[PDB]
PDB file of C-alpha atoms in Angstrom:
ATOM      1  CA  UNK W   1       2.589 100.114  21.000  1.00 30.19           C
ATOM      2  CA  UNK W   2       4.924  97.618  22.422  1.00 32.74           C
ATOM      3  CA  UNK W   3       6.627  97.148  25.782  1.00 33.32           C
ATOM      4  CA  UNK W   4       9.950  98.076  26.647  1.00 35.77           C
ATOM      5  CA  UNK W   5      12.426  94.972  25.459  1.00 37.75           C
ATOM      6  CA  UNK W   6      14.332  93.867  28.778  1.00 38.91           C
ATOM      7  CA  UNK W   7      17.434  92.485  30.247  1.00 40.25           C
ATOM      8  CA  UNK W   8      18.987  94.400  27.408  1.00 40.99           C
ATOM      9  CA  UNK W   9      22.838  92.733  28.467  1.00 41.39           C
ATOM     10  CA  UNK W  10      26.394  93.018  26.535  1.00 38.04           C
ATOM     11  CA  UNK W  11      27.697  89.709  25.836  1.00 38.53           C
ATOM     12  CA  UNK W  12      30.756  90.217  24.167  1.00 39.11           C
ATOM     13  CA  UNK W  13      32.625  93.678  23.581  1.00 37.64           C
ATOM     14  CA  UNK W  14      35.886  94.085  20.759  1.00 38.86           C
ATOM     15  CA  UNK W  15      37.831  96.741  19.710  1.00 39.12           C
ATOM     16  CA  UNK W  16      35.193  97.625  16.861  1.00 36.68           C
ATOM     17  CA  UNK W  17      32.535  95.700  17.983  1.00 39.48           C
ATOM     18  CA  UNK W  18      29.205  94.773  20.430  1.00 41.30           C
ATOM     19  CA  UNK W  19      27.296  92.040  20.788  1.00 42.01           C
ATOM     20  CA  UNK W  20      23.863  92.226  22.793  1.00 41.86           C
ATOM     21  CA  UNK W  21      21.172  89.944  23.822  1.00 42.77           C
ATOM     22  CA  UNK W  22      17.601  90.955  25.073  1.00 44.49           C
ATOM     23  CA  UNK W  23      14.359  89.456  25.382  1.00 48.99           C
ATOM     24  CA  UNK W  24      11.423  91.182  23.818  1.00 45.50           C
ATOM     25  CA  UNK W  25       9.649  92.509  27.210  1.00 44.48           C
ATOM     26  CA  UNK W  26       6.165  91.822  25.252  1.00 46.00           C
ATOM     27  CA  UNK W  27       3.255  89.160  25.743  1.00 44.23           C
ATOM     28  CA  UNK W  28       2.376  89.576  21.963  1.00 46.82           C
ATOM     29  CA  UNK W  29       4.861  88.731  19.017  1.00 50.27           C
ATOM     30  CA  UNK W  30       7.251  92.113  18.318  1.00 50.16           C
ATOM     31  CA  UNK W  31       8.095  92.181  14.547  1.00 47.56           C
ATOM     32  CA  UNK W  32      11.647  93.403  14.791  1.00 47.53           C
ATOM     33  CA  UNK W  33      13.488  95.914  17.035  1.00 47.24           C
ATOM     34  CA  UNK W  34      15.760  99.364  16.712  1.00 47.91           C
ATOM     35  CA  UNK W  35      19.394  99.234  18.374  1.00 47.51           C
ATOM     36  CA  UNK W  36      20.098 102.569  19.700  1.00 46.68           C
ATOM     37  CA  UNK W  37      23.746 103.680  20.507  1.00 44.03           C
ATOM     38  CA  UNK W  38      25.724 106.148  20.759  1.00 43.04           C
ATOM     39  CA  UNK W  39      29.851 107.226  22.449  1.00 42.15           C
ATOM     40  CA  UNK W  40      30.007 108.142  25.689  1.00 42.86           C
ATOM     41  CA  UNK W  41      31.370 111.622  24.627  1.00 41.20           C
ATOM     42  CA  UNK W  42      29.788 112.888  22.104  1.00 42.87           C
ATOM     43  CA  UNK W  43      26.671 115.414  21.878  1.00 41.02           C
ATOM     44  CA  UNK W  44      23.664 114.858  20.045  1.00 46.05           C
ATOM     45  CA  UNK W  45      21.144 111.697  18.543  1.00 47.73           C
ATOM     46  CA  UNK W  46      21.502 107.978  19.073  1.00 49.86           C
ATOM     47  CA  UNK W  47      22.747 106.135  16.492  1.00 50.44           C
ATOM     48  CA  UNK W  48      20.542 103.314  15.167  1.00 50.79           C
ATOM     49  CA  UNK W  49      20.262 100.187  13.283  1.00 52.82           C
ATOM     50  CA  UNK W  50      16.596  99.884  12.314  1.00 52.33           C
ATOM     51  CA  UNK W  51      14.696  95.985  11.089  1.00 51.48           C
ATOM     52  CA  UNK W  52      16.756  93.504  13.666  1.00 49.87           C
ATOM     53  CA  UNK W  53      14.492  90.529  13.497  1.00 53.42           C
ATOM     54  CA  UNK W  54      16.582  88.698  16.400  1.00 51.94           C
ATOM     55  CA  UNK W  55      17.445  88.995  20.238  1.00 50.15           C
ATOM     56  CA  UNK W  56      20.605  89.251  19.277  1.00 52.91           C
ATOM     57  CA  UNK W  57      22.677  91.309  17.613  1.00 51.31           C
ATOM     58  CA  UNK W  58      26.297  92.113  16.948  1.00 52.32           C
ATOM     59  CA  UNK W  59      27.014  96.040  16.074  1.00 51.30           C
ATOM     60  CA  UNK W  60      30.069  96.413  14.316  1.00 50.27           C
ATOM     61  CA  UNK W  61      31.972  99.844  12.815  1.00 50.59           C
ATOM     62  CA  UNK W  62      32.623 101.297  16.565  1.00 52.76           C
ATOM     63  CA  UNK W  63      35.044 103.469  17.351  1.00 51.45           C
ATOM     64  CA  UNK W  64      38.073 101.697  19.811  1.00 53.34           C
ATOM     65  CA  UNK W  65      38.548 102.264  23.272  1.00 50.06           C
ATOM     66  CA  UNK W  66      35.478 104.280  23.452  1.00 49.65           C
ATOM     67  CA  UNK W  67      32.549 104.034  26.145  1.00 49.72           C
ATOM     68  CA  UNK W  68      29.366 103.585  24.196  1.00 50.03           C
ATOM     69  CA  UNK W  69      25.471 103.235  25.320  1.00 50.51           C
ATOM     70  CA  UNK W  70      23.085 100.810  23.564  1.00 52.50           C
ATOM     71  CA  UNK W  71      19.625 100.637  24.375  1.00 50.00           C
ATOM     72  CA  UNK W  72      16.940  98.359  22.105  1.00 52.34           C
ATOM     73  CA  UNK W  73      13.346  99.137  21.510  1.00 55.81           C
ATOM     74  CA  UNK W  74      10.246  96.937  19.967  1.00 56.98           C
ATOM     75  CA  UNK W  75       8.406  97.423  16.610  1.00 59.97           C
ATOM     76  CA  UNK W  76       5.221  96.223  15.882  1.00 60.28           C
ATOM     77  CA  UNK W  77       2.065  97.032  13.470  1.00 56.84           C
ATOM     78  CA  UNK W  78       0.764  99.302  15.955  1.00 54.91           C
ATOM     79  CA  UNK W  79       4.353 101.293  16.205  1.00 56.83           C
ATOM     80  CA  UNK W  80       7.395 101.520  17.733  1.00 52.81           C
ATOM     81  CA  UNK W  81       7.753 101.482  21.484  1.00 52.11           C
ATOM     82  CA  UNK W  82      10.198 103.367  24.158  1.00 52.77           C
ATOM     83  CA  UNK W  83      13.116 102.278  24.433  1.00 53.84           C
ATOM     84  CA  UNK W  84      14.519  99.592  26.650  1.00 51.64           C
ATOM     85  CA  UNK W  85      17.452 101.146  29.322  1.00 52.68           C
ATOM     86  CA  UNK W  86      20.061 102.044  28.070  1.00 51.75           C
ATOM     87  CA  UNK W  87      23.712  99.988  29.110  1.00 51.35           C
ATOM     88  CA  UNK W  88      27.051 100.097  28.999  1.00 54.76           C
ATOM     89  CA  UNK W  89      29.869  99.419  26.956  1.00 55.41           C
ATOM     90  CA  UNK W  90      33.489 100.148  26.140  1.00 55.81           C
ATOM     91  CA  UNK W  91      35.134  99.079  23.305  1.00 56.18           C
ATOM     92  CA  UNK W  92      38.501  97.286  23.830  1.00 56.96           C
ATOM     93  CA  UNK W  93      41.974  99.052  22.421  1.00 55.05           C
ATOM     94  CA  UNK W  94      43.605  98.894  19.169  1.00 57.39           C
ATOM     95  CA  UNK W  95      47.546 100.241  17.947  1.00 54.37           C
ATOM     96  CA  UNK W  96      47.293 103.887  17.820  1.00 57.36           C
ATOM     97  CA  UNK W  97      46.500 105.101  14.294  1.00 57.45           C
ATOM     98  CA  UNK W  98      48.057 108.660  14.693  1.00 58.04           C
ATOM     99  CA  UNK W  99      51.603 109.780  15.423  1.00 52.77           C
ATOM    100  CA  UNK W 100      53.074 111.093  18.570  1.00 55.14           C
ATOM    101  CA  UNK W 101      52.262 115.382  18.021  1.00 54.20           C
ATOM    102  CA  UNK W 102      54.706 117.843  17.905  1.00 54.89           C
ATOM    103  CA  UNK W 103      57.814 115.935  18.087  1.00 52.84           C
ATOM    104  CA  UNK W 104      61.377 117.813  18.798  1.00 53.44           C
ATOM    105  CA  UNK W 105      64.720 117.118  19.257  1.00 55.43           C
ATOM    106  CA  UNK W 106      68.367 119.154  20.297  1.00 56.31           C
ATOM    107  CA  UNK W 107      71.762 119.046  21.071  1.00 52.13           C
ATOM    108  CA  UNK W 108      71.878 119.289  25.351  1.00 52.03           C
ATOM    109  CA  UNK W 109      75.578 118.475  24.507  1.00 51.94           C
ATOM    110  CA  UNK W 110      77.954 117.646  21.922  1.00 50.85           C
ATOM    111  CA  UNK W 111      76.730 114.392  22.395  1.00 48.02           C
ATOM    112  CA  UNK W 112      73.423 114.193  24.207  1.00 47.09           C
ATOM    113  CA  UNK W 113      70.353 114.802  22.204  1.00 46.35           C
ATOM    114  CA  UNK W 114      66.969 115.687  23.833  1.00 48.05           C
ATOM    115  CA  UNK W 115      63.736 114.306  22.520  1.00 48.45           C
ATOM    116  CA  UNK W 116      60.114 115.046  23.123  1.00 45.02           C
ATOM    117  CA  UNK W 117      56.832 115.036  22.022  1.00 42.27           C
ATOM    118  CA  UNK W 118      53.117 114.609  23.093  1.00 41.56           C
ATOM    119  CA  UNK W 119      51.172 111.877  22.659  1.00 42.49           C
ATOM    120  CA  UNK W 120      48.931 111.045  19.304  1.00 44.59           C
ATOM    121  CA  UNK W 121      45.584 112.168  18.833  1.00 46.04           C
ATOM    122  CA  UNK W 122      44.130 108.568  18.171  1.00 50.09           C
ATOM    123  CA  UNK W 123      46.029 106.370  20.490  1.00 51.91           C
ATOM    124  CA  UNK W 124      42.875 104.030  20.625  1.00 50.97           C
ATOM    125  CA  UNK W 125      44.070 102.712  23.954  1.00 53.76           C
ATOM    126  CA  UNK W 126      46.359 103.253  26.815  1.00 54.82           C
ATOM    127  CA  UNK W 127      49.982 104.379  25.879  1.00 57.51           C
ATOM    128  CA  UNK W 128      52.378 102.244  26.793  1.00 60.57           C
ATOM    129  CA  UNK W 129      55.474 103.622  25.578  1.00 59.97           C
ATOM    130  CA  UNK W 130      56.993 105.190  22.737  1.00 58.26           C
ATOM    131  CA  UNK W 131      59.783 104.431  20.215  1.00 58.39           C
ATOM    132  CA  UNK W 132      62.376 106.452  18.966  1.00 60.68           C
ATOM    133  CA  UNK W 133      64.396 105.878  15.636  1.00 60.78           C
ATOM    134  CA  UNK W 134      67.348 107.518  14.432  1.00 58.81           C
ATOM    135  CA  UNK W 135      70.140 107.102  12.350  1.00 61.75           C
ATOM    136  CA  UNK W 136      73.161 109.062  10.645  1.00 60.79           C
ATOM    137  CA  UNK W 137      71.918 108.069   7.063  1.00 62.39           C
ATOM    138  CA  UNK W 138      68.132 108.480   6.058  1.00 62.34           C
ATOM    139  CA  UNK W 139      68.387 106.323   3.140  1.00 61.44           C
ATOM    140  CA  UNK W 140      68.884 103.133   5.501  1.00 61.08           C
ATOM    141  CA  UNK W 141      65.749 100.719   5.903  1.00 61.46           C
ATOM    142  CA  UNK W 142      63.558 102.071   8.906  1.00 59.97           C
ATOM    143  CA  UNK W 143      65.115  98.730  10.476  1.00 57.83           C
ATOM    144  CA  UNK W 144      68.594  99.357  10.350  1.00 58.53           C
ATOM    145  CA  UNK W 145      67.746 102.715  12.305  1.00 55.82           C
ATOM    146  CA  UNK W 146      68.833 102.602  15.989  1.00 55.36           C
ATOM    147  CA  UNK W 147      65.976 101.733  17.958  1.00 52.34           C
ATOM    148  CA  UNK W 148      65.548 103.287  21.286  1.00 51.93           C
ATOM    149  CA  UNK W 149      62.356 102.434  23.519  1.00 52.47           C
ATOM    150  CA  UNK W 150      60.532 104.593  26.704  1.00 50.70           C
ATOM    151  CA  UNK W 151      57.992 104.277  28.575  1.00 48.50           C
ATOM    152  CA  UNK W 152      54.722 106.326  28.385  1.00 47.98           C
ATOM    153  CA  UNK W 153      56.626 109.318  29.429  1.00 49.59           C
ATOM    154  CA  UNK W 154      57.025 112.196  26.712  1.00 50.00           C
ATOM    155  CA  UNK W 155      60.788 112.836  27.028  1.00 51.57           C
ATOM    156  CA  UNK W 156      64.025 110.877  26.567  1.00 53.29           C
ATOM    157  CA  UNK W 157      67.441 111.350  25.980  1.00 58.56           C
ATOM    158  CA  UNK W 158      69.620 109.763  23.922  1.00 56.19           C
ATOM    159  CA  UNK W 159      73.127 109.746  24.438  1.00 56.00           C
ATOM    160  CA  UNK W 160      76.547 108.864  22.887  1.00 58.65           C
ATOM    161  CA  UNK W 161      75.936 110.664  19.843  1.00 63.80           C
ATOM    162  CA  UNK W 162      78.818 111.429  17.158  1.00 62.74           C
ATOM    163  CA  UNK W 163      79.711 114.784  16.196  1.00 59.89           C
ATOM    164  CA  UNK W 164      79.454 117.076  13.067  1.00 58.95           C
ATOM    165  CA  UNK W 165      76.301 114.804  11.770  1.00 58.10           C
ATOM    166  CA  UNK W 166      73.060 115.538  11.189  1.00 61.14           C
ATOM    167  CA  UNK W 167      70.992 112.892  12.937  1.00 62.93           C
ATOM    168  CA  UNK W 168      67.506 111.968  10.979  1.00 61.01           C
ATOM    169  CA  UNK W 169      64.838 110.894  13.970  1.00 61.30           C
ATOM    170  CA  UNK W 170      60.968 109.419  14.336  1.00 59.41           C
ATOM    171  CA  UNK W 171      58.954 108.772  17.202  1.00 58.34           C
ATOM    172  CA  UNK W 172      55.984 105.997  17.519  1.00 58.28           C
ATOM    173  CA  UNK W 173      53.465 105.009  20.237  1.00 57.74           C
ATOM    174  CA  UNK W 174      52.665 101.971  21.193  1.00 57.21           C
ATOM    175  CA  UNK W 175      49.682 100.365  22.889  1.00 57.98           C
ATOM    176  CA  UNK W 176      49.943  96.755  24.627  1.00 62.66           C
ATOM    177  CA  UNK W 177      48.128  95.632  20.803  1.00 64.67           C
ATOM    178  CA  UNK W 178      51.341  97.301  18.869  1.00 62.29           C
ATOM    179  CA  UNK W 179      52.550 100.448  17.377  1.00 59.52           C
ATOM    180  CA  UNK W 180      51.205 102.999  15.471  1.00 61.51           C
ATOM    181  CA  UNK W 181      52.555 105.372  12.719  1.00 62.68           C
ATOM    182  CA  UNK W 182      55.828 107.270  13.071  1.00 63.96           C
ATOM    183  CA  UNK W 183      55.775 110.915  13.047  1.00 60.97           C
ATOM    184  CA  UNK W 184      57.404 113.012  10.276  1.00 59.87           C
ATOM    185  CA  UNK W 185      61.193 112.553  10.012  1.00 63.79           C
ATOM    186  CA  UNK W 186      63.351 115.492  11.590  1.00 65.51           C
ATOM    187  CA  UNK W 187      66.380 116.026  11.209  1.00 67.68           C
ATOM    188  CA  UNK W 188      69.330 117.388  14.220  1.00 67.97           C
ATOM    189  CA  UNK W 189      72.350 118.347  13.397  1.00 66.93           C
ATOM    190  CA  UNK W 190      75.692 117.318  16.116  1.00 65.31           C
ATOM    191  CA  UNK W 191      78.556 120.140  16.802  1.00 65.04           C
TER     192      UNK W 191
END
């Protein structure tokens, strides 16, 4: 059985992505080695990629802004050997890729409307703010909605509103990479 590999060290770290370096920890030739990973939060096995012939390595398909451990062990024809330690990643961010949850809006005033929410499931990052379209008329492009931006906070108002319309309204997050999907379109209607 071989050694441990050592100096297991991240080199580069993406959204999606890890790239690690080692040396093979053995006096004797290794054949190939196992990558071992797995997300900082979750409860069960290591994942693995199994036949690496390098000391280097670049695992792909990970999750964003997600702490991971990655530890690397040696194969050779006698077996496979323990594992080197394990170190630390975490994956940079990406725009969120669910909506803000639960979003709701009314009437404070004839003219004031009251909008909040809570923030999306997948934000893949930090939240930076949020942005809320709405518009008398639906069938207008999502760009000729009025645009109104916040910051990370989950309430806003929005004021000067006309009366006796029903007000169609969407809410998006935003990470410092860019905005993810809106939520479903509600509707509020003015006195």
């Amino acid at each position: 059985g071989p050694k441990p590999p050592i100096d297991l060290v991240v080199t580069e770290t993406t959204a999606t992505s890890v790239t690690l370096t080692w040396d093979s920890g053995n006096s004797e030739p290794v054949t190939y080695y196992g990558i071992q990973y797995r997300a900082a939060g979750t409860e069960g096995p290591f994942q693995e990629v199994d036949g690496v012939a390098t000391t280097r390595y670049s695992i792909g398909g990970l999750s964003p802004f997600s702490e991971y451990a990655f530890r690397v062990l040696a194969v050779n024809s006698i077996g496979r050997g323990p594992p080197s330690e394990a170190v630390r990643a975490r994956t940079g961010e990406q725009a969120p890729s669910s909506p803000p949850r639960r979003v709701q809006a009314r009437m404070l005033s004839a003219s004031t409307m009251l909008v909040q929410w809570e923030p999306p499931e997948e934000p893949n990052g930090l939240v930076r703010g949020y942005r809320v379209y709405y518009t008398p008329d639906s069938r207008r492009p999502p760009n000729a909605w009025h645009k109104h931006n916040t910051d990370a906070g989950l309430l806003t108002t929005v004021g000067s509103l006309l009366p006796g319309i029903t007000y169609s309204l969407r809410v998006l997050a935003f990470t410092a990479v860019g905005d993810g999907p809106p939520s479903p379109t509600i509707q509020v209607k003015t006195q």
